[PDB]
Structure formats: C-alpha cells, structure tokens
C-alpha cells in the first residue's frame, strides 16, 4: 500500500484522473450505467486510472473506505447537473478518505503537506459545477 | 448544515469527541454493542457529542458520507488493540469526509484553513495507538 506522501499523492492523483474522466469525457457512459433499476451501485476510481460503476464489495468491513452507495437510485429524481454535482462531492470526499486511510501513520506536518498537494488540484465538484 | 470554516470545525470537533469517547472511556460498552451476531453495524459520531452503534442509514444514497460498514464482523478475529486501531482510522477518515462534504462550497484557501484546524487536533488513530 502507498505509505509515503509521494506514494499516497500519486495514488490519489490517479484515482482522481479516473473519476474526472467518468464525470466529464465519459459522462454519458457513466450516466447510462447508473440505472436506477439495478441493485445499489457506486463509482470507483482506481490507481491504474480506470473508473467503474459496480456493486460494493460483498464482504465487510472493507479494506479501503467505500464510495457513496446507491448513487443510481437517485439519478432520475433530480436534475442531471445536480445528480452529477452530488456524485462529484461524494467522490471528492471518498478520494480524500482513501488518501488519509493510507496516511494514517503520517505525522501532523506530513498530513499538512499531503493535503496541500491535494488542495492544489481543482475538486471534482468544482469542475462539474463550473466553479474556479 | 455547517457552512463556514468555524461551523464545520465545531461539527468536526463534536463528532470527534463522541468517537474518541467510544474508543477510550466507553470502549467496553462500545465493544459489546459491536455484536458479531447482529447485522452489519457502524460507529457514528454526532454533533451533540454522543456516539452511536447502529445499522447503516435507511436512505440510499445517504445525505452524509457513511462510516465503515460491518465493523462488528471483524471484532473477534483480531487483536483488540488492532481492531480498535482500524476502527479509529476508518473513523478518522469518516470525520474528514463529513467535514469536506459540508465544505464542498469552500474555496481553495478556505479548504486549507479548515484542514489546518482539523490538523490541530490529534487523530483518533494517534490517541488509540498512543502515538
């Protein structure tokens, strides 16, 4: 598992790149996969820069923090831009959660450095909502 | 919901105090409530400083980020200090997720300010592992 600030931040950046693609370039594919009829689905970003919409893991408790569950259930009950904004916020939170799970052993100053690197990247919410 | 940096940190601090109490002063009560025989359980911290062991939220998807699911399923299969340490790290992550969920509309300078405040308190993992 990623252990140094450099390893954790490269893992973060890769997952984020996958989720950014899911919510922008591939948004039609992501939207179509989140069918409200299906069982509960979540949006995962992986450090190979792949994104997927999938069931959560069957065995619990999970190794890593898990993304928001059942985002497809909400898709048709709101404006598409608002559904995408909500997915984006929860995906920002998940990415931060994963990084600080790997970073549990970092000291206070290392945690501050890790966040500063993350905070220099625009959030998925800001990109999706058009904030700068 | 909390919106300003101070509002969000007040909420964070109270939820953290709840979770810290569950993992230290109230740990035997907390441990016993995490019954491997029940359905999957999570540990919540609330803004009134109370902690709660319960089933995951009824509403799907949840309004707030949710804590780790099923921690009672792992309680008996590892060292007690290790189970508590992993509950603590997942609980630390959950606190951070909740705060930056509320802080979604903060700008980049405001987000740095919030993290610096959160980073002024020791984490649950550091207290529980005695670091």
């Amino acid at each position: 598992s990623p252990r140094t600030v450099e390893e954790i931040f490269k893992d973060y950046s890769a997952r984020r790149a996958a989720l950014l693609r899911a919510l922008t370039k591939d948004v039609d594919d992501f939207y179509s996969q989140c069918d409200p009829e299906k069982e509960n689905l979540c949006l995962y970003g992986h450090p190979n820069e792949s994104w997927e919409v999938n069931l959560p893991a069957e065995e619990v408790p999970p190794e890593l923090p898990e993304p928001a569950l059942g985002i497809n259930f909400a898709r048709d009950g709101m404006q598409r831009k608002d559904w995408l904004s909500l997915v984006a916020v929860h995906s920002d939170c998940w990415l931060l959660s994963v990084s600080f799970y790997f970073g549990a052993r970092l000291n206070r100053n290392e945690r501050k450095r890790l966040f500063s690197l993350i905070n220099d990247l625009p959030t998925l919410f800001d990109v999706v909502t058009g904030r700068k | 919901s909390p919106r300003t940096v101070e509002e969000i940190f007040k909420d964070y601090s109270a939820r953290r105090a709840a979770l810290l109490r569950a993992l230290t002063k109230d740990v035997d009560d907390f441990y016993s409530q995490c019954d491997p025989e029940k359905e999957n359980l999570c540990l919540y911290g609330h803004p009134n400083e109370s902690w709660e062991v319960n089933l995951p939220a009824e509403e799907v998807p949840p309004e707030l980020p949710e804590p780790a699911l099923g921690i009672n399923f792992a309680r008996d299969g590892m060292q007690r200090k290790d189970w508590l340490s992993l509950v603590a790290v997942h609980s630390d992550c959950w606190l951070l997720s909740v705060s930056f969920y509320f802080g979604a509309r903060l700008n980049r300078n405001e987000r740095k300010r919030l993290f610096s405040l959160i980073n002024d308190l020791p984490t649950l993992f550091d207290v529980v592992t005695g670091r």
Binding site: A57, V60 | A74, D76, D82
Partner: peptide, 12 residues
C-alpha cells in the same frame, strides 16, 4: 501488517 482479521457478508 494492520488488517481486519476477518469479516462477513454484507447484510441484505
């Protein structure tokens, strides 16, 4: 390392 000792199937 630090890992959960075991687990259970997600309730449903």
């Amino acid at each position: 390392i630090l890992a959960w000792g075991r687990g259970g199937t997600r309730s449903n």
